Design a protein around this ligand. Sequence first.
Ligand SMILES: *[C@@H]1O[C@H](CO)[C@@H](O)[C@H](O)[C@H]1NC(C)=O
Lengths: 50, 50
Amino acid sequence: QCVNLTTRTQLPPAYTNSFTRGVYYPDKVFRSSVLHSTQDLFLPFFSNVT
Amino acid sequence: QQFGRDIADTTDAVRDPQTLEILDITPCSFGGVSVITPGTNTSNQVAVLY
Ligand SMILES: *[C@@H]1O[C@H](CO)[C@@H](O)[C@H](O)[C@H]1NC(C)=O
């Protein structure tokens, strides 16, 4: 049970910026007033996104 | 979150795994012993500094 959507117009998407996005909490460890640094999968700042 | 760390990288915070209760660290007691005494030829009285 599905309907084919053939009314979609083909067009390449535009590109925007990623100034201060992609950050998230590293783990489930509470941190207060500490400058903790770690290696993790993180979106680069000011990067190209679609 | 279940655990926590301080500025000295010590597990000073923990979460109870049975209810929404959070606990921290505040020491029961402490002590640094140091004994002040004169020479054995002079006398034998001693005193302890904490
Ligand atoms: C991202 O890349 C596309 C294609 O490489 C380009 O057209 C677009 O201008 C880029 N955007 C930025 C913000 O650099």
